[PDB]
Paper text:
[name] plays a key role in glycolysis and gluconeogenesis by catalyzing the reversible oxidative phosphorylation of D-glyceraldehyde 3-phosphate (D-G3H) to the energy-rich intermediate glyceraldehyde 1,3-bisphosphate (1,3-BPG). Recent studies suggest that [name] [name] is a major virulence factor and a potential vaccine candidate. [name] [name] exists as a tetramer. Each [name] subunit is composed of two domains, and consists of 13 helices and 2 β-sheets of 9 and 8 strands.
In addition, we have determined the structure in the holo-form using a new data set extending to a resolution of 2.0 Å. In the holo enzyme all four subunits have NAD+ bound in the active site while in the mixed-holo complex only two subunits contain NAD+. Two conserved water molecules bridge the cofactor pyrophosphate and the glycine-rich loop in the active site of all four subunits in the holo complex as described for hGAPDH. In the apo-enzyme structure the distance between Cys152 SG and His179 NE2 in different subunits varies in the range 4.0–4.2 Å. In the holo-form, the distance is 3.4–3.5 Å. In the holo-enzyme and the ternary complex each subunit contains a bound NAD+ molecule and rmsd between the individual subunits are in the range of 0.06–0.14 Å and 0.09–0.26 Å, respectively. Upon cofactor binding [name] undergoes substantial conformational changes. These changes lead to stabilization of the protein structure as is reflected in a significantly lower average B-factor for the holo-complex (29.7 Å2) as compared to the apo-form (60 Å2) and the mixed-holo form (60.8 Å2). In the holo complex 45% of the accessible surface area is buried in comparison to 33% in the apo structure. In the holo-enzyme Arg235 forms a salt bridge with Asp184 and hydrogen bonds with the side chains of Thr182 and Gln185.
Residue numbers in the entry:
A (entry chain A): 2 to 335
B (entry chain B): 2 to 336
C (entry chain D): 3 to 335
D (entry chain C): 3 to 109, 113 to 335
C-alpha cells in the first residue's frame, strides 16, 4: 500500500481522492491546501458536477475521517514546508496549478518530505509527460518528478496516435470546445494572469483561448512532433469538453476505415461510441478520451482529403481517471 | 414606401421589425403568427438578449400601435389564407421556419395575398440565395421567392470569398460554435424533427449538430461549389456565435497576409477586429460577419499549409441586419 | 401489477427508471407522440439525471430494457390507447394534457386501463395524494387519483409538521424553482398565453403562479384556506427550494422548529443541517428535504414570523413520491 | 469636482460610465491591482452592460477616454495612493476590502470617501431619494449602502408612511456576483455556499440589508430581517418583502401607494417583466405591481410586495446620484 499526499484539494485533487478510494494499494493520508478541514470536507461531500461523495465524511481536529479513516489536513502555502513523511507519504499529487515545473515540484522532495511528485498538468520539457495507455512505457520508476499532461492532451493523444499508426499524419489543426474552468472569472474582472479573455464572465460567453496541447504532443507521441497546433473555445458548461482534429494523412481513407481504426484502438483509456451523445453524457466517465464516430468526416475534393475526427472528454473525470492510472502504475514500479 | 408583411413574429421576425423602423423605404403593415396581439406586443417591447424596444408599443383591437402607427395582427395558420393585400403588403418576410421552400413560400402569393416573398432561411436549390454585399447583384427584381440564406452562411461567405479572391481555396472544413436556438428543447424531450441531439436541454449541453451552410456555399459563391463542408457545436449562450474555417489554399500565405486581405475586404457586412473579444461583445452588431484577426493561424509543416480563419456573428442581429439589407434592396428593384 | 406510461417525458421517464427497482410493478407499455428510437435514446441519456442504469436496445414497435420488451405506441388520443393488450391495469398519466377526472378517465374503457394516476394536480373531485402525508385516504376503489405537484409534495410534510406541533394561522410561500418544459428556450409566443413563460427560461429570473399553497387543503384539510404563494423560476435545469413564511398559534424558537422537523423525518421528508445548494439535491429520493440552516424565527414586539425552507428535486423528489403512491395504490387496488 | 476610483470592478467601471454623463463630476484617477491595458479592455467591453459608449485608448500609465487622459495606478494600500497629484478630492472606494470608517479613512491623498457598500454603524448610510437629506457636506466618510438596501428602502418607506410596518421578512432572489466561485472551490471568506459554482446552483446566502435598514429609515429599526437566494443570472435581482402592517389594506391600495411614491430612484410598473428587462436600468428600485399579494385569514393580513433591481446598474445609478449631490455640498 503506497501512501499518497495531495497538494491542492481542488477539482482534480478532490476527484483524484474519490477515484483513489477504489484503488487498492494506493491511499491518501495527507491533504495540503490553504483552508480549514471543514471547507475541504464539505467540498469533498458535495460536488456540483460530479455528485454527492460515495461514503461518509466527518470533520475532526486537524483533518477529517472518510469512511472512518482519518486524513490529515494542513494549510501550508510553501511546498518546502510540508512535512509529508510524518504521514508516511511517498508520492505527492501536485494539483495546485502553481508548482507545475521540475524546480517547483521538487520542493516537495526534502528531509521529512516526499520522495516523488506527479504534476497534474504540463510540467515543462525536462519532465516526462505521460498519457496512460499511450506512452506510460517511458517510465522506469527512478523519476522524481513526472507529469500527467493536460486534459486536452489525454483526449487528443490516443485519437492522433491511432491516425498515425494506421494512416500516417502529415499535419493537423485542433479545436477544443471546452467547459469553463477555475482560471476564468465568474464575472468580468481583472485576470491575475493578464489574459483579456479569461478576464470575462466564463459562464456567460464563448471565450477563445490558447492551448499548448497540440504543440506539445511531441512529448507524448514523438513522431507527431511539430505536426499539430490548435486552440480552444471555452463555453458555458461547468464540466465536459470535446476535441475536434482536422488533419491531412499519408493515405487515402474513408469514414468507415477511420471509425474502424478507432474502434480497433479502443481500450480502458480510449472509448468508442456511435450514439449521438452530448456533453452532459460524458460527465464522470472513466475514459481519457471517447471517440465519437457520428462526427467523423472525410472530405475529398479534386483527389485531396481533409479528415475530421472528434473525441469527447470530461476535462475533470476523464483526466483524473488517466491521472490515477498513471499514479497507480508509477507507485507500483517506484 | 414599400409595405411589408411578417409571417412568424419570432426572433428574426421581431428583430427585422425593429431594424425596419430605421429604414425609410420600407414599413411593416401586417404581422401574422399563431397568437394574440398582447403576446406579440409584449415580446416586441421586452427582449432578453437584444434589449428593450426603442419606442412605444400599445396593444389595440386586432393589432398594436408602434410609436402611434397601427400594425395589424392576424393568427392564420395557413399562408394561403393570409389576406396580405388588405393591408397593402407587397413583400412578405417568411420567418416561421415552416414554409422555407419555393412551393410553400409561394402560398403567400395569391389573389389578395402578397406579390413577393423573402424566406429568412435556406429555401432550396431552386430559389436565389442572397448574402448581402457578397452576391446581391444576382437579383433583377422579377423573382417571386428569394432566400436570405442562413446565419452561418452570411458569416462564412465574405470570409471565404476573401480567401478565394486573394489566394484561391482548394477545400475546407468549417465548425460553428453556435448559440442555442428555438429549434432545441429547453429540457430533454422528444424532438418534433427527429433530431436526437436537438432533443437535449439546449442551455445545459455542448450539442453537436449538422449544418448545410458550408455545403450550400456554391449557391452564393459558385466557384466554391463542392469545396466546403462543416458542422456545428451548439453551446449554452442564448445568442452569439462564431465560425472557424480550416482550409487549404492555392497560394502559400502568412498570418499577416491573411489578416490584411480580410481588412481590405471589410465593408458594412464584413467587419474586421484585432481586439480579443468574446461572444457577448457581438450581440446586437450590424455586421453579417466580424473577422477576428486574433484567432488566425497558418500552419506550415514540411512545406504544406493549413489556414484557420475565424469570424464572429450574432446569429440573431447579424443575420437580421443582412436580411433587412437584402429586403430593402429587393423592394427598391422589385418588378 | 402491469403499468402503462402516457407521456414519456421528464416525469414519465424518471418514473420508468424508479419502477425498475420496485418489485411487483412493471411497465409494459409506453405511449407518446414519437418513434421508439427517440424514446429509447432519451431513456439512455439524461442531462440532469445521468446515464440509464442498464441496457436499452431499440426494436420494432418498442424497445428492450435489460432484455425485457416494452411496447411503444404514438396515439394522440387516450381513448384510442389499447392498454389491455399489454396487460396494463394502471396508467401513469404524465403528458400534462389530460390532468382532470374527465380527461384521465378516457384511458378507462374495455380494452383500455382500469385505473389512472395523474402526475399533476387533477382537480378538486380527484383524490390528491402526497405519500407519507395523506396516502391513508386511499381505499383502492378509486379509478382516477392525483399524485399532486412537485411543490405540493415539498410543502406538505413541512407545513403538516408546523400544524401538528405549533398550529398554523396563515402563511405565504415562495418557491425558487428550476426552469421546466412549459417555458420557452428563447423569447417566443407561449401557447398558454403566459407572458412570463414566453421568456427564455435559462436566461432569466421569471415570476410565475403556482396553486400549491392554495390547494394544500386537498392534502391537509386543516390548512384549507390558510396558505397562498408564488414562484420564481430561475436558470437551473432541475432542483428547487420552497420558502414558507408563517404565523403560528404558539411562540417558538429556531431550535424547537428544527427539532420538530427532525422528529417528523421519514422516507419522504428528509432533514439536513449541511449548507447545501441545489445541485446537491438533484436525484434525491426524498419528496422534501428540510434545511435547518435556513430557519428563521423573527420576534418583533412579541409577534413572531416563522420562516421554514425545504429543498426538492422537482424531477426526482416528485417522481419518488409518485412511484411510492403508485406502488401502494397498486397493492390495494 | 475631481473623483478617484479605488477598485475598477463592476461598480467602479459602471460608476465611471455614468460619470461621463454627469457635468461637474469627473474621474481623473483609477487605482486597482493591474495594468492599464486590462482596465481599458474591461471598460470597453462588458458582458452584461454592453460596449462602452465612446473611445478608449491605452497609454503609458493610464488610458484616454474620448481623448481625455485618466491615470491608472496599481497601489495595494490606500495609504500609499497619492490622489491629490491628480486633483482628486473624493474617492469612490469600490474594492470591497476597505468598507469601514478606519479602512476608508486611509485615503497628498483625498479629502473625502464614498464607500460603495455598507460601511459600519458609525458611517452615514445613504439611499438617494430616501435619506440623502441626512448629509450636510462635512462628512469625511459616507456609505452608498448596498444594492439590496437601495431596492428595499423606498418600498419599505412607502409601506411605513402609508400604512405602518410592524415587522417583515425579506427574500432577495439575486444574480450571482464576484464573491462566488466560478466552480466548487475553497472560499477565502469561509462561506461554504459561496464556495460553490455560482452559475450552476441556487445558493442560499446571508444579507444584512433588512437588519441594517434602521440606518436609512430609523423608524424601521429592528423590524426587518431577511436572506438571499443567489441564482444563475450574471446580473439582475428581485426583492420580495412579506410584512405585517398597522392598517388593513387591499392589493389596489398597496399598489396605488407605491405608484404615488414613484420618482427617479423608485420606479413603478404593471408589465409582467423578467430579470433581463431590468439590466442597465437607472432606477434604484422598480416596484412590480403584478406580484403584490394581500392575504387575509381570520381577519389577519400578510402583505407581499416585490421590487426589481439591477444589482449592478440600479445600485450604481443611486451611488452616482449620491456622489454628485455630496460633491456639490462638500
Ligand atoms: N479542471 C480541469 O479541467 C483540469 C484538467 C486537467 C488539469 N488541470 C490542472 O490541475 C491543476 C488544478 O486545477 P483545478 O481545476 O483542480 O484548480 P482548482 O482551483 O479547482 O484547485 C486548486 C487548489 O489548489 C489550492 N492552492 C492554491 N495555491 C496553493 C498553495 N500554495 N498550497 C496549497 N494549495 C494551494 C487552492 O486552494 C485550490 O483548492 C492545474 O494545474 C490545472 O491546469 C485541471
Ligand atoms: N434565430 C436564429 O439564429 C436564426 C438565424 C437565421 C435564420 N433563422 C431562421 O428564421 C426562421 C425563424 O427562426 P426563429 O429563430 O425566429 O424562430 P422562432 O421560433 O423564434 O419564431 C418562429 C415564429 O413563427 C411562428 N409560427 C410557427 N408556425 C406558424 C404558422 N404556421 N403561421 C404563422 N406563424 C407561425 C411562431 O409563433 C414563432 O413566433 C427559421 O427559418 C430559422 O432557421 C434563425
Ligand atoms: N418536470 C417537473 O418538474 C414536474 C414535476 C411534477 C409534476 N410534473 C407534471 O408532470 C406532467 C409532465 O411534465 P414533464 O415536465 O415530464 O413534461 P414533458 O414535456 O417533459 O413530458 C410530456 C410528454 O408528454 C408527451 N405528450 C404530449 N402530448 C401527448 C399526447 N397527446 N399523447 C401522448 N403523449 C403526449 C410529450 O411528447 C412529452 O414526452 C405535467 O402534468 C407536469 O405538471 C412535472
Ligand atoms: N456587484 C454588485 O451587485 C454590487 C452591488 C452593490 C455593492 N457592491 C459592492 O461594491 C464593491 C465592489 O464590488 P464589485 O462587484 O464591483 O467587485 P469586483 O470584484 O467586480 O471589483 C473589485 C475591484 O477592486 C480591485 N481590488 C481588489 N483589492 C484591491 C486593493 N487592495 N486595491 C485596489 N483595488 C483592489 C479588484 O481588482 C477589482 O477590480 C464591494 O464592496 C461590493 O460589496 C457590489
Ligand atoms: Mg485505495
Ligand atoms: Mg421604415
Ligand atoms: Mg419493477
Ligand atoms: Mg462628468
Amino acid at each position: 500500500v503506497v501512501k499518497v499526499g495531495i497538494n491542492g484539494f481542488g477539482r482534480i485533487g478532490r476527484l483524484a481522492f474519490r477515484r483513489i478510494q477504489n484503488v487498492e494499494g494506493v491511499e491518501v493520508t495527507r491533504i495540503n491546501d490553504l483552508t480549514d478541514p471543514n471547507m475541504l470536507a464539505h467540498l469533498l461531500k458535495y460536488d456540483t458536477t460530479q455528485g454527492r461523495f460515495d461514503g461518509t465524511v466527518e470533520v475532526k481536529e486537524g483533518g477529517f475521517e472518510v469512511n472512518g479513516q482519518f486524513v490529515k489536513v494542513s494549510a501550508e502555502r510553501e511546498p518546502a514546508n510540508i512535512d509529508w513523511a510524518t504521514d508516511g507519504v511517498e508520492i505527492v499529487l501536485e494539483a495546485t496549478g502553481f508548482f507545475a515545473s521540475k524546480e517547483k515540484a521538487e520542493q516537495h522532495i526534502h528531509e521529512n518530505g516526499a520522495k516523488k511528485v506527479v504534476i497534474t498538468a504540463p510540467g515543462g520539457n525536462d519532465v516526462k509527460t505521460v498519457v496512460f495507455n499511450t506512452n506510460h512505457d517511458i517510465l522506469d520508476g527512478t523519476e522524481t518528478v513526472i507529469s500527467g499532461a493536460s486534459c486536452t492532451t489525454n483526449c487528443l493523444a490516443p485519437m492522433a496516435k491511432a491516425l498515425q499508426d494506421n494512416f500516417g499524419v502529415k499535419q493537423g489543426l485542433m479545436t477544443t470546445i471546452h467547459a469553463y474552468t477555475g482560471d476564468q472569472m465568474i464575472l468580468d474582472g481583472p485576470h491575475r494572469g493578464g489574459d483579456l479573455r479569461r478576464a470575462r464572465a466564463g459562464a456567460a460567453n464563448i471565450v477563445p483561448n490558447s492551448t499548448g496541447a497540440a504543440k506539445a504532443i511531441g512529448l507524448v507521441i514523438p513522431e507527431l512532433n511539430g505536426k499539430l497546433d490548435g486552440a480552444a473555445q471555452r463555453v458555458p458548461v461547468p464540466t465536459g469538453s470535446v476535441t475536434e482534429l482536422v488533419a491531412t494523412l499519408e493515405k487515402d481513407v474513408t469514414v468507415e476505415e477511420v471509425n474502424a481504426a478507432m474502434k480497433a484502438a479502443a481500450n480502458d483509456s480510449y472509448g468508442y461510441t456511435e450514439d449521438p451523445i452530448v456533453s452532459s453524457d460524458i460527465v464522470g466517465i472513466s475514459y481519457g478520451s471517447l471517440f465519437d464516430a457520428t462526427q467523423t468526416k472525410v472530405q475529398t475534393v479534386d483527389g485531396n482529403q481533409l479528415v475530421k475526427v472528434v473525441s469527447w472528454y470530461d476535462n475533470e473525470m476523464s483526466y483524473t481517471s488517466q491521472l490515477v492510472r498513471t499514479l497507480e502504475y508509477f507507485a507500483k514500479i517506484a
